[PDB]
Amino acid sequence: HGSSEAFWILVEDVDSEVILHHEYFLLKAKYAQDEHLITFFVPVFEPLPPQYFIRVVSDRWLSCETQLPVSFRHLILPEKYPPPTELLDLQPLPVSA
Amino acid sequence: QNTDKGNNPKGYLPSHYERVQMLLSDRFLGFFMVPAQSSWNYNFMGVRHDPNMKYELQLANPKEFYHEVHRPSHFLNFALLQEGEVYSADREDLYA
Amino acid sequence: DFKIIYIAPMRSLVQEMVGSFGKRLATYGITVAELTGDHQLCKEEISATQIIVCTPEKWDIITRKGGERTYTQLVRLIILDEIHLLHDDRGPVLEALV
Amino acid sequence: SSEFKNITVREEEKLELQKLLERVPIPVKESIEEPSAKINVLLQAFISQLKLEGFALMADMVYVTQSAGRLMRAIFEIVLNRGWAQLTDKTLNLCKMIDKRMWQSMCPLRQFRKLPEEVVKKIEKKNFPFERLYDLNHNEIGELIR
Amino acid sequence: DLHPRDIDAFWLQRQLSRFYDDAIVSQKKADEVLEILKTASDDRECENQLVLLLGFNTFDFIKVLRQHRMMILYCTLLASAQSEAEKERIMGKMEADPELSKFLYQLHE
């Protein structure tokens, strides 16, 4: 393996034809045998997909791929938030108010 | 009750089926389930396919028909490089 | 606190200059190595070694990808072996490097 | 690629190229007297480890594969940056197939070059999935491969 | 875009009725808006009286009331002039101001 093993974290839709989030992941030799928290943010579109897929593939090794289906079956999305209060174009307030 | 696997078996009428309404959708998305241990296409691995075979499933997307893992005899039956690269070309990979 | 780049034109000249400078600078503890492999292996080999023996193209692809940027304030000496490679079709690599 | 703009297919090797074109596993849409079909089957004859015979053809193969490392990595980075997931799976796999010099349906134990190739071809002969080998013991592996 | 011919005697109440479904309260809000537009020192305290009376809602109408404060007021006073002497009195008051004389010209032709 050497000093490091390089991986690609590819997060893609149900069709696996758009990468919603790719990122490089260096698994360094000091930090094998322990969990790496990789926090990222993926977009979710209005035809709510059944899954995303996280493929963590090796950058160097053939047939080194772990796919994980992030399933959206029991995913309760938050409500589409109310619109912000508008700046009503008030005539600007003198301090005598 | 049918056993005649031909294209015109006996007792086969067009009252055996009725066309039902089927329509398409942009409004929702479906998904796929592929087998877990192997993949789905056994048209090249035809002897490896039994009708009484057992398979688990996998929430994945299916590979193409002519994908690499579906025709392993096209990629795996190669003779190994035995006394190859001995009269090859000297070219230095300068960038790699 | 320092790195020395030895840019030699051919790769087997580089692989024997690694042995020559590894024998001659052995009493100093100086790590001589050859820039090969993927870009992560090359930035690890730059971070680990002092005499970095490479082709002009390998050092140029490292400077283009940026894997020496943390150690160019540590590069104090580049040695362009066979600089009449400026006449070669590999000439633009050396002209870009210099 | 424009790195292979001077690769021409000479007639003195065309017969050998046909013996590659009937054996390379990815089909080639071109005819073999077009140079792109030559670069195609030379890359696929490299990854397949087919033994070539013409000196010009082995030299063209060594050239197109030493360019193919960077060229396939550049295709992979273009395709990854634009976000195409199927093509980035194909291109990253083809980078690793050019680098490791094996097709991805072959055993992953060919990337460890320290194994005997006879036991690796015994593993590929007994074609189970590679992930089956994880659950077995060192006795159970050795008697599954015999 | 608001013309003096567009403002009639009950244009104000017709515009308040888009926010008040009742008609007694729309009539009350209309004559309250009329005395806000009339008994006003100047612009911003009148517009603050309008957002005090009609809320932070109805603000596009308060914008229209503030932008045309003299046109809406004097054309509503002229169109709701029930006497004829009251009508020529309001028109004589409007001829003394060139902005109101401009609205008076726009009312006729």
UniProtKB/Swiss-Prot annotation, chain B:
Part of the U5 snRNP complex. Component of the U4/U6-U5 tri-snRNP complex composed of the U4, U6 and U5 snRNAs and at least PRPF3, PRPF4, PRPF6, PRPF8, PRPF31, SNRNP200, TXNL4A, SNRNP40, DDX23, CD2BP2, PPIH, SNU13, EFTUD2, SART1 and USP39. Component of the U5.U4atac/U6atac snRNP complexes in U12-dependent spliceosomes. Within the minor spliceosome, which acts on U12-type introns, interacts with PPIL2 and RBM48. Core component of U2-type precatalytic, catalytic and postcatalytic spliceosomal complexes. Found in a mRNA splicing-dependent exon junction complex (EJC) with SRRM1. It is found in: Nucleus; Nucleus speckle. Widely expressed. Plays a role in pre-mRNA splicing as core component of precatalytic, catalytic and postcatalytic spliceosomal complexes, both of the predominant U2-type spliceosome and the minor U12-type spliceosome. Functions as a scaffold that mediates the ordered assembly of spliceosomal proteins and snRNAs. Required for the assembly of the U4/U6-U5 tri-snRNP complex, a building block of the spliceosome. Functions as a scaffold that positions spliceosomal U2, U5 and U6 snRNAs at splice sites on pre-mRNA substrates, so that splicing can occur. Interacts with both the 5' and the 3' splice site. Changing residue 70 to R: In RP13; no effect on interaction with SNRNP200 and EFTUD2. It comes from the Eukaryota. The MPN (JAB/Mov34) domain mediates interaction with TSSC4 and SNRNP200. Has structural similarity with deubiquitinating enzymes, but lacks the residues that would bind the catalytic metal ion. Contains a region with structural similarity to reverse transcriptase, presenting the classical thumb, fingers and palm architecture, but lacks enzyme activity, since the essential metal-binding residues are not conserved. Residues 62-96 are annotated as: Required for interaction with EFTUD2 and SNRNP200. It comes from Homo sapiens (Human). Coiled coil: none annotated. The chain holds residues 2240 to 2335 of 2335 of the full protein. This is Pre-mRNA-processing-splicing factor 8. Changing residue 71 to K: In RP13; reduces interaction with SNRNP200 and EFTUD2. It is linked to Retinitis pigmentosa 13: A retinal dystrophy belonging to the group of pigmentary retinopathies. Retinitis pigmentosa is characterized by retinal pigment deposits visible on fundus examination and primary loss of rod photoreceptor cells followed by secondary loss of cone photoreceptors. Patients typically have night vision blindness and loss of midperipheral visual field. As their condition progresses, they lose their far peripheral visual field and eventually central vision as well.
From Swiss-Prot, chain D:
It is found in: Nucleus. Widely expressed. It comes from the Eukaryota. Catalyzes the ATP-dependent unwinding of U4/U6 RNA duplices, an essential step in the assembly of a catalytically active spliceosome. Plays a role in pre-mRNA splicing as a core component of precatalytic, catalytic and postcatalytic spliceosomal complexes. As a component of the minor spliceosome, involved in the splicing of U12-type introns in pre-mRNAs. Involved in spliceosome assembly, activation and disassembly. Mediates changes in the dynamic network of RNA-RNA interactions in the spliceosome. Belongs to the helicase family. SKI2 subfamily. Component of a core complex containing at least PRPF8, SNRNP200, EFTUD2 and SNRNP40. Component of the U5 snRNP and U4/U6-U5 tri-snRNP complexes, building blocks of the spliceosome. Component of the U4/U6-U5 tri-snRNP complex composed of the U4, U6 and U5 snRNAs and at least PRPF3, PRPF4, PRPF6, PRPF8, PRPF31, SNRNP200, TXNL4A, SNRNP40, DDX23, CD2BP2, PPIH, SNU13, EFTUD2, SART1 and USP39. Component of precatalytic, catalytic and postcatalytic spliceosomal complexes. Component of the minor spliceosome, which splices U12-type introns. Contains two helicase domains. The N-terminal helicase domain has catalytic activity by itself, contrary to the C-terminal helicase domain that may have a regulatory role and enhance the activity of the first helicase domain. It is linked to Retinitis pigmentosa 33: A retinal dystrophy belonging to the group of pigmentary retinopathies. Retinitis pigmentosa is characterized by retinal pigment deposits visible on fundus examination and primary loss of rod photoreceptor cells followed by secondary loss of cone photoreceptors. Patients typically have night vision blindness and loss of midperipheral visual field. As their condition progresses, they lose their far peripheral visual field and eventually central vision as well. This is U5 small nuclear ribonucleoprotein 200 kDa helicase. It comes from Homo sapiens. The gene is SNRNP200. The chain holds residues 1021 to 1166 of 2136 of the full protein.
